[PDB]
Symmetry: D2
Subunit: 413 residues, 4 copies
């Protein structure tokens, strides 16, 4: 299906073969784990049911071409809807059965599945946050079925994403009812997963906007505020998508670090936006700064990426319409994140940033700084200290110095 016989192999950074990896060596050992284990790369997923069966075959062909172990899918992208909900689910069941056998034969694993509650017109007002309770019931039936399929196929995570949960205008929005109903829907899904013994990690993917004016899981901190408010934080981690970070006005590594220090870095969608375009372009990730600094955050996460992966939720350019461009595009993104891993790991091993940070904040490990951190110091004792009028000498933050190191490691590692 992809104009490409054979598999893409690692050929080193000097190779001029456009169908070879320059940096992704799956077997390269980095800090005691292989690149394959560090990155856990995932790949995204005639008419009617015949087109669907052919899509199955093409998905696993591509997984074999790229030597990728993990895939993801949305229900409505693997099978067409029927004339009833029953027939929709029969069509899905049939295609799931084909996928399950391919997974067994090929040894491929389901990183996550999800429900597409975005495409069909019934979701024009959203799904959980719809104004039409009939749509909420259909959305529950659809996610119910998707949790069944996630359990059947052994999904390691299950994703809820922004779709159409937000608003076009606050003028016609009952904000409390929509947010309450979102929280009800998510808890109902948690209840159902527990009842069927589905032990995948639940993930929410923040997205700030597009196609809606505002979408409720705006960024990591906004989603965490909602999760904490509704007693859902214990059930959900975040699926962080690079382009959605920058759409929200943050760097990717900002979202990742916020997620990390709240125990909620669950998985990533590796792509990139165009910061001069206010929409979500979902380009395959090529920026070596973004991939280096993303893997820097991931490598410090408990268990690294953990049960998540580096998932290529990305779109070939409109002008890269040939089948082979799908292979070129993944090679672009896989080599960019493999280089990012190499560079990040060496930055971490050399404490290239950590030693500067240790020195920056050293005052909080001695004297009055230690007393602040320990809780001994209060406004009375801090004032008495400052009333000594000891000269205050700040230290440079060395931003340009560190930026030179980042450039040096990107090139030299």
């Amino acid at each position: 299906y992809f104009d490409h016989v054979g598999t893409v192999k690692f050929e080193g950074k000097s190779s001029t073969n456009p169908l070879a990896f320059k940096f992704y060596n799956p077997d390269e050992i980095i800090l005691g784990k292989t690149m394959r284990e560090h990155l856990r790369f995932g790949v995204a997923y005639l008419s009617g049911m015949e087109l669907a069966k052919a899509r199955v075959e093409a998905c696993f062909e591509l997984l074999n071409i790229l030597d990728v172990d993990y895939f993801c899918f949305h229900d409505r992208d693997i099978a067409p809807e029927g004339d009833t909900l029953q027939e929709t689910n029969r069509n899905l069941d049939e295609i799931v059965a084909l996928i399950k056998q391919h997974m067994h034969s090929s040894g491929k694993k389901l990183l996550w599945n999800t429900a597409n509650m975005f495409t069909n017109p019934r979701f024009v007002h959203g799904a959980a946050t719809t104004s039409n309770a009939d749509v909420f019931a259909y959305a529950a039936a659809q996610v119910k079925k998707a949790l069944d399929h996630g359990k059947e196929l052994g999904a390691e995570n299950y994703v809820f994403w922004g779709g159409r949960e937000g608003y076009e205008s606050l003028l016609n929005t009952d904000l409390g009812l929509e947010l309450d109903n979102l929280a009800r829907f998510l808890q109902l899904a948690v209840d159902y997963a527990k009842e069927i013994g589905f032990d995948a990690q639940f993930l929410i993917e923040p997205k700030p906007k597009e196609p809606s004016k505002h979408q409720y899981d705006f960024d990591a901190a906004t989603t965490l505020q909602f999760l904490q408010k509704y007693d859902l934080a214990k059930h959900f981690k975040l699926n962080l998508e690079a382009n959605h970070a920058t759409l929200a006005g943050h760097t990717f590594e900002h979202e990742l670090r916020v997620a990390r220090i709240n125990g909620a870095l669950g998985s990533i969608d590796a792509n990139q936006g165009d910061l001069l375009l206010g929409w979500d372009t979902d380009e395959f990730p090529t920026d070596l700064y973004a991939s280096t600094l993303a893997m820097y955050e991931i490598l410090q996460n408990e268990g690294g990426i953990g049960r998540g992966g580096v998932n290529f939720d990305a779109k070939v350019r409109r002008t890269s319409f040939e089948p082979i461009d799908v292979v070129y595009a993944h090679i672009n993104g896989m080599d960019a994140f493999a280089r990012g891993l190499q560079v990040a790991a060496k930055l971490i091993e050399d404490r290239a940033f950590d030693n500067v940070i240790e020195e920056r904040y050293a005052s909080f490990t001695k004297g009055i700084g230690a007393d602040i951190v320990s809780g001994k110091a209060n406004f009375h004792t801090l004032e008495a200290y400052a009333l000594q009028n000891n000269p205050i000498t700040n230290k440079s933050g060395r931003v340009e110095l560190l930026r030179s190191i980042l450039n040096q490691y990107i090139i030299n590692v």
Copy 2:
């Protein structure tokens, strides 16, 4: 001296007097309350101490010119630093006593005061989130003094703003330590206000960025996430500044509604940015959509603006450098928000929006929708409902219709 003898007075929407209110009639009653009480307008603040005393005289002259009942100040904006912290506080105490005098003779009240921990170079790395423990101690001494002065002058609120609390680069940032230390600082402040019996409402003002790349209290939701995480939410509401809403990628009314439904709409700074400029211009508020929709949110807040007010944290344009421009600018903003109050109050009384919202979400007050809201319905019963395959018919959201009504009321109320 503002080149202006006497008071600005209401002269109706027909007046061509540039130094007269066209819409702010302080005694006009709207829904059982005067404009004065709805809006609770606030105004925000030779060398050395003589320049400082002159500035006090100019501030209360302006309060009298504008017939404004409330003012705000920052400590380092009202008095110069001395050669020691002791002398800085002596200078500040002397000016605070001159302010207390003018409050006596004029009856004007302190809406809030705050510590300016932005201007002096000791705060280059921040205040609570500084890398230098000596700066943390100075910041504590400064806020301790400001809480004393707030108590002494009867401040109804006390504001913490995000001046230097954030980062220039995550490369050199110990994020967890900075946020832990910000939470420690705010809790120490809470402790001290309780010890001295300072009963003002504590407020945090979100700001997403500028001057720094990222500032931690990015928007209402992000600040609420931090407050909830560190058990501080019970002590703080938000001071919402309109320009900071749009700088964060939200409308002002979005930030206000989010705060409102989390019980955290404490006060507002009334200004406006330029959405084509990304840098916090703090212009006086002139946009009648923004003022109407801000007042629409405030009127539905418990107690209206409550102990807060509509505070003109705004700057005349660089090209409006004459004294009289300060009066023109305030008339601009006071009339904009008075018109917004009139229009919003009639939109609420007529239920121009509430009737469309009521009909939009009516399905959640009966049938399967009521069972969703009550918790009776789960995935099993919702699926059984959806499996009936009853046709789903959504209703239009009528955005353009409501925008017509908004235009009509802004013009015709």
Copy 3:
């Protein structure tokens, strides 16, 4: 449209949702009726059966709204065939039905255009394509549209951004693409001359979307291109409000730049959302933007001239009932009619012009007159400044002027 009658003016107090609150087509404003000031335009089963039905729905909507002008794109009014010949046969057949409807209903064609955006052949652009075969098809399509524009009496003809730009400079021959864009536009000019097509040629700037950069980025950038290639004498601009803010400008900025360069040809009335980086094409509702747009248009030579105020806008995705098309045009028609009322009174009252006159009075006398005349040079200006006479600037009065704007929007 689930609304059989005609929408009429019922004044500002009316609570009829299907009535104009500000657009009174007959109201006289500075010697001209609202109808002729604004020249409102409306922008336009399977296969040919669906095509014919859409013609009927178009003119049904023109009658509901009492609108005199319409626009269309060729590929939006007729389906393609299995050959170019068949595509033009389908197109000709629908054009014949539109012409009869124009005669019977009295409606006029503001402009037509060629849609060289949808079909996959234009993936790399039309005039700026990398594939010469596509350039040829593009020329054939515009040729046919110039013929239909002549046949239907189009007062303008529009070239718009579509796919003329780049996704990446890494693979772009910029000089060739711009040279070919100019070649294509000249050929079009050559052909309009042959058949006696007299309509005003217009270029619509768009800075980006779907592409990373589109070459007619804004008014000034398109003007730089037209001047470089000796095409400025043949083209004016079709200015769309959303494209101004997408380019980082206010709509009134683009309108004034176009106006002082004699290139304000026509407008597409809509609005974006300045918090969303994409071209939302909402029906215009912002009274500031509509007031200040009509302020610029009223000062253009002949007002909007041969152009019009064309509602190139889409209903919200959540406004999916037929009646919402009517509600949305009422929203935008009333917003721009109010804009005209306020702008005309501001102009009549010289509310801004008197302030501008005083602001720059220094350039009508003394050393300022010698600067303007060309008499003053660096030598005589230095001698003047070396007198060290005090410089006293005057306030720009921006906050004062904004209060006036608010007052007129509410009061006129």
Copy 4:
């Protein structure tokens, strides 16, 4: 004084010396020319006259530390104003005499000088586009003096920059008069340079905004529209500043290519913005994509950078306040652009992009495409060709392929 002493020297990519160039080897020959000549790096430029004289010393000390051959200055940055214009020019002349001798003894060259008509409050409304003719006269006297000084010191270019030439609001702007006066002023300057024999390349620096809402030289194409309209294009090239390109919504390499194909790539100011911050941050350039692609456009320019240079119009971060950070910051930017030159030259030498472009547009060098370029093809004949209905087959744009190549050369060159 810069805490350094000695010269920064090249130590190669593996050095761990923070005070050594890792990529800038001034003597390395690349396509027949040294790095030093390719890049022509430029560096930017007690109270009263004593502080001014100390600044002269510190400037040339830094030029010797960095081994940089070119510098720039603004008149009001090198000498304080006097109590009269005569005194201002006497102060300026005295400092210019000191700089002239330093240039002779040190062998450093003046890349460009300019007039600062931004700081003093007389320019609150602008300079050439002021509303006050008295200010226009002062502006004329100041530029006249700067052209005198530029000729005396042998400036190779002379810069006009954005300052406050724009508007705060169109409500109070006579746009035609301001633009006419801008053109008059620039022609007066051209006249005067001719009269004194000043042979430097005149340059205009585009800037879209900040501090003003709109600045007239918005970007390259907008400035070119102005230069063509007023018959000034024959006299001016552009000084392209990287942060101003992105502030205007363009990439830096876009502005450079637009300048280059219009004969107007005169010089550059090498810095970078933050595309998530809406204001002009003027950070030292570190992004290897931006520096690579900028040197890519420059190397294809007639004569490369020509009489211009790669000028570091950049500011150290607020938090990098130690003197040594100035050295670290230039090492960061000089190594970034030296690496950019290495990578760009090999990309150009290998025709890594040019061969893909040659094939992409091959259709225009034969058949109907040649008739199009030749002018022979017209609408009648192109339609005849299209009416044969021959299959249209487009070829992929290969963007992801090309991005992989860019990444590979950045690492491997």
